[PDB]
Write an enzyme that holds these catalytic residues in place. Sequence first.
Site, PDB file in Angstrom:
ATOM      1  N   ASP A  71       0.850  -1.191   0.000  1.00 52.76           N
ATOM      2  CA  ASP A  71       0.000   0.000   0.000  1.00 52.76           C
ATOM      3  C   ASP A  71       0.889   1.246   0.000  1.00 52.76           C
ATOM      4  O   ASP A  71       2.068   1.140   0.393  1.00 52.76           O
ATOM      5  CB  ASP A  71      -0.931  -0.017   1.199  1.00 52.76           C
ATOM      6  CG  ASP A  71      -2.140   0.869   1.015  1.00 52.76           C
ATOM      7  OD1 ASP A  71      -2.752   1.155   2.176  1.00 52.76           O
ATOM      8  OD2 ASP A  71      -2.528   1.239  -0.085  1.00 52.76           O
ATOM      9  N   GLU A 103       0.188  -0.024  -4.609  1.00 52.17           N
ATOM     10  CA  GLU A 103      -0.902   0.939  -4.683  1.00 52.17           C
ATOM     11  C   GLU A 103      -0.287   2.303  -4.955  1.00 52.17           C
ATOM     12  O   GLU A 103       0.383   2.869  -4.067  1.00 52.17           O
ATOM     13  CB  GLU A 103      -1.736   0.999  -3.393  1.00 52.17           C
ATOM     14  CG  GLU A 103      -2.936   1.943  -3.516  1.00 52.17           C
ATOM     15  CD  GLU A 103      -3.133   3.016  -2.450  1.00 52.17           C
ATOM     16  OE1 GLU A 103      -2.101   3.469  -1.823  1.00 52.17           O
ATOM     17  OE2 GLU A 103      -4.292   3.410  -2.235  1.00 52.17           O
TER      18      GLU A 103
END
Length: 476
Positions: free
Chosen positions: A206, A230
Amino acid sequence: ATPADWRSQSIYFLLTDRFARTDGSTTATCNTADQKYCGGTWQGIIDKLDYIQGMGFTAIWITPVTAQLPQTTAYGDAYHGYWQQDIYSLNENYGTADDLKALSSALHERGMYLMVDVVANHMGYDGAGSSVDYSVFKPFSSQDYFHPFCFIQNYEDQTQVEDCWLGDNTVSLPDLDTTKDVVKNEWYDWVGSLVSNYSIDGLRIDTVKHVQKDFWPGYNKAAGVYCIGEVLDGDPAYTCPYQNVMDGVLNYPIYYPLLNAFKSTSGSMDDLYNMINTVKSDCPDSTLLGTFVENHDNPRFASYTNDIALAKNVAAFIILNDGIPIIYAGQEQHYAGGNDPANREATWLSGYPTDSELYKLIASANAIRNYAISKDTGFVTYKNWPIYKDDTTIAMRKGTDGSQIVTILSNKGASGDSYTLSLSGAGYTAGQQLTEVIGCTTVTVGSDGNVPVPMAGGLPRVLYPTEKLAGSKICS
Ligand SMILES: *[C@@H]1O[C@H](CO)[C@@H](O)[C@H](O)[C@H]1NC(C)=O
Ligand SMILES: [Ca+2]
């Protein structure tokens, strides 16, 4: 498992706290507005692997595993995993180290992969950034490991994006100084040892755009598995470059026009067609991106429209596009929650029906992708080719000549009229028999090489040569 290993995979992304309880309850209260632990566990996931594998997924992505801030904050509990404090302890809400290893083993026993979500950018803390007691962080138990406290003022200043803190003075997100060799070595040692200890096959990283690029290659190498980042930006010119420092990124460039194309009977097929070609040509490797339309950080597809045909088309696109399909737990039960926390619904409250409209559509689309890959070593490296669009239609081709899947998608929705699309550019030979593998009908290619595709009910159509299905379980 390597990037090359991961090209063939299809991922079911779930929130550990929200997918399945150890007791298997389908009625246990989970009010998303409460923002509290609902009691999902690693043992719950194991219990429900038949449900996931039944949709033809080959992998799961689970939310982070590290020990979190203990508080019920004004934004609720750390049920989602993104507010870590002790990276050398597990979040005891989900189970013990033996449960996480059992999950890994249970997947491997079924020939599936485990992807684990990880954050390097930040820790979590309940309250103001000026109140942080750094002794709660392990191993980063000193302010010396952290960037000076500031918030991002200017999202166009990439130094601020990297060096300032996410979050706010309600829940602060202390920003690790990932330019320090001590922070790099800590994180690199940690991620290699996490992957080894739990036999993890891949990572979802992330928060990638908030950490300077020169951090990532050593992290991806230390993990020793495929890492998908991400990078929350719809511009391929911003997002694509990150695939030169990490194996894959989530396909946020396709996300926006894909959502816009199918969420409305007026959605732009042009914007989707053009972004498919832009990513295919421009991104380092479109076959190593993650395709999605739904996650825990955006409103669910069905929050925009409850039209089931539109949902069937967008799910079919996710499965048949370049790269790794990623379906978010609840999408298959047509969940309609809007922004956080409404999009963190408990999957168990559906009762996990395996005969829901989208369960069956996903099972059919994954079945033909899994079968086509097993027969065609070129499927995963053949870059998806958009062959046709009009105001309500896009058609695309993927796979080695003679073995190609040709997918026709529509945004007419459930009230779409019955008609015939004469499809050119499919590249099948005149007179060949095709199976439409969603509806399990046959279509014969014309003498002129055009495909007469029956369109009804705004339904997606997925075509594959009938002779290549011989001996398969597809359309028994
Ligand atoms: C993995 O296990 C080793 C051996 O005990 C330990 O040194 C290391 O910190 C563990 N890593 C994680 C992240 O659990
Ligand atoms: Ca940062």
